[PDB]
Structure 1
């Protein structure tokens, strides 16, 4: 458990943490409270793993789209800023952090991906995606490359996939339809087909991650990169003469990046709740506070009206806003992470040719919509027919495909042993045993010691 009398904050390592550290350093010699800022790898997934065990940081910075999930697991306190404080920020940023009626975080900044290009290597930037393959074949000559960006994270490839009709969840009569998923329609299919083709013809390498693309652009090896306002800082230091511009169109349609609002949540387990509120409202979300972070790594447009009034003239902020305009603010519904993971997997499996586009994307449809396997359905039909009173274990299938049907609590359940002729599973004459516990959980212990064939296999 986190201790009382300090503040532990987590932010992504691509953001201006050292800028945030100074705000906490100003906070420290003002109230007398130690603020230590960290930036763990895989933060957005690490937070729920530590939190639910009452162990996270006090405050957490991530784009708003993950917050609905956190809120549903009960990891976030609901924030209580007065009407005076709410007026200091843009209404739409508040919408982004509003979940099931309640405000669940403080909005900080509006992020959108932009096309970044090298002016010395590329006077005029391409307007269409279709002309980049033609462009890279010219840059073959001078040992340079047209375009590299993070192909590991579907945030970067989504703008292309969304362009021609692909979407996450259908919005419908003031709500998202979590079963209606635009991940393998004609539009999404086209977009990825096009991406996959850039790698086949060797215009990009499927193993290109964030820091590979970053290093390539900033040293002058590549002509373009796709990135957000945080990236700018290092590019300045590099002294590369760069432009920030509207993302290329695909099939005459604009790229549609998913816009994120950087946001700060309060750990529901954290005792230091008022102290956390004290920090964000009075120290971070201020001209000074936000300026300090922005200097370190640019935030984009900021949620605080007053300080946004300052940054507005920056042509690069304009470009961010032009792209954000073409795209959309992400939903914050708890299914967003199932969506992201689906697309993350689709893109990588296709990127490496483990799957075709259509296989990769039909899988993504499955994944994103939280749909039931055939195996799931088969197993659930095993008890539906006969009725039990009281606590029950839900049907589930274990990692060797044994179906443990819905069963009464506190009972031993007997199922046929698995065996496999090559890929073909079948059931033997022997049995495996598993207890359904008094509390409706399946026991971790599964006795397979009589399963003669599988032991031999």
Structure 2
């Protein structure tokens, strides 16, 4: 069981967890309530396992796409902030955490992937994905490469797959059709074929992950990378002269990144629900609270209107929002977990050459509509 009179918080290890730990220390000085911040590996998978038994953290942080599945299993408490508190966050961020008409989380920040480039290697970023093979050929002649990014997580390849027609679930009439899936369609095959051809032609390696791409870019070995807000702090330290901009178009269509709203849910088994609420509304969801996390690892565009006005001046945040406006808020429906696992498998098999693109996407389509 969860201990009473204390707060345990789980947040991903790529977030500003030290910063969040500081907001917890502030809460503890004022109220006497100890706050413990942890970042278990695979917490988005572990949470449903432990929460099912009345264990786990009092508060869990993740993008909103996972939350409909948790709420469906009865693992999240319904939150009911008063209208006054609600008016402080952007309306659309509240929409991302509404499930079956109920609020199941507090929206924290908005994030989308962007194109990041080394201005010393590339004064101007490519406008199309199609010109990258040629950029790479010339950069290779100088000992560098054009682009390196995480190919192990479908989140990073999805903008290209969706660019010319790929989609997860058909949204229509204020509802998602869990039977109308678009991973096996023409647009999706075109996008993933482009990706697989980059690897075949030696422009990228199928095994590239987050650390391999980060190391290469921050070292000045590659002219471009694709990443989210959290990557910015480490690039700042690298002293690389970088720019953050809009992703390239594919077949003349803009890349469409999935947009995630970092959110905070309260475990339905938690005996400390009123403490969690006090912490979230009066300590974390304040200019001071968000600034502390943001300083540890950039949150992106925050849900709190008052603090977002100040961050909006940052060109990196502008680029982030521009990429978001071209993408799509991820669905929060329970089927999202099956979508993500099926698309991860498809991308890795196709990229590693274990299956062809058609075989890979066909299996995913089948799995998701099961």
TM range (shorter): over 0.9
| Cα distance in 1, alignment partners of residues 217 and 117 from structure 2 | 8
CA distance in 2, matches of 1:134, 1:42: 38
Please report the RMSD computed on the Cα atoms of aligned residues, expressed in angstroms.
Answer: 3.2
SS in 1 for 2:130: helix
Is the 8 Å Cα contact of residues 181 and 369 (structure 2) preserved in structure 1? Answer: no
Give the SS at the match of 1:30.
helix
Deviation string 1:14-62 (CA, Å, 9 cap, x unpaired) is: 1100110100011110100111101111111111111101111110000
Q: CA offset at residue 294 of structure 1? A: 0.7
Deviates more, 1:294-303 or 1:186-195: 294-303
Quick one: distance in 1 between partners of 2:208 and 2:252? 27
Q: Which is further off, 169-178 or 190-199? A: 169-178
Q: Counterparts of 1:122 and 1:147 in 2: how far apart (Å)?
A: 11
Larger C-alpha radius of gyration, 1 or 2? Answer: 1
TM-score (norm 2): 0.98
Deviations 1:307-335 (A, max 9, x none): 00111111111100110011011111111
Note if contact 2:178-2:369 (Cα within 8 Å) is conserved in structure 1: no
Counterparts of 2:209 and 2:84, CA distance in 1: 43
Distance 1:282 1:268 in 2: 21
More displaced stretch, 123-132 vs 168-177: 168-177
Q: How big is the shift at 1:456?
A: 38
TM-score under structure 1 length normalisation: 0.79
Q: Which has the higher helix share?
A: 2
Tell me the secondary structure at the aligned position of residue 234 of structure 1: helix
Alpha-carbon distance, 1:141 to partner: 1.5
Q: Is the 8 A contact 2:179 2:369 kept in 1?
A: no
2:51·2:75 contact (CA, 8 Å) conserved in 1?
yes
Tell me, yes or no, if the aligned pair for 2:244 and 2:316 is still in contact at 8 Å.
yes
- Matched residue SS, 1:130: coil
1:242-275, Cα deviation, whole Å (9 max, x unpaired): 0000000000000000000000000001111000
Q: Taking CA–CA contacts closer than 8 Å with sequence separation of 6 or more, which of the two structures ends up with the larger relative contact order?
A: 2
Deviation string, structure 1 residues 425-448 (Cα, Å, up to 9, x no partner) = xxxxxxxxxxxxxxxxxxxxxxxx
Paired residues of 2:342 and 2:364 also in contact (CA < 8 A)? yes
> Structure 2: how far apart are the matches of 1:13 and 1:456?
32
Q: Which has the larger share of strand?
A: 1
2:117·2:125 contact (CA, 8 Å) conserved in 1?
yes
CA positional deviation for 1:342: 1.0
The secondary structure found in structure 2 opposite 1:15 is coil
Higher mean displacement: 48-57 or 70-79: 48-57
CA distance in 2, matches of 1:220, 1:14: 22
Moved more, 266-275 or 138-147: 138-147
User: Structure 1 runs of 4+ off > 4 angstroms?
Assistant: none
Q: CA deviation at 1:217?
A: 0.7
* Partner-residue secondary structure (3-state), 1:149: coil
CA offsets 1:361-418 (integer angstroms, 9 cap, x no match): 00110xxxxxxxxxxxxxxxxxxxxxxxxxxxxxxxxxxxxxxxxxxxxxxxxxxxxx
**8 Å CA contact retained: 2:246, 2:323:** yes
| Cα deviation digits, residues 348-373 of structure 1 (max 9, x gap) | 010111110000000110xxxxxxxx
Equivalent position of 2:334 in the other structure: 334
Cα shift at 1:232:
0.3
Partner Cα separation in structure 1 for residue 306 and residue 90 of structure 2: 10
Aligned with 2:282: secondary structure? helix
Superposed CA deviations along residues 164-195 of structure 1, whole A, max 9, x for unmatched, are 00000111222111011010100000000000
Segments of structure 2 that go 5 or more residues without pairing to the other structure are: none
In 1, Cα distance between the equivalents of 2:55 and 2:136?
Answer: 49
| Number of aligned residues | 368
In the aligned structure 2, how far is the partner of 1:69 from the partner of 1:456? 16
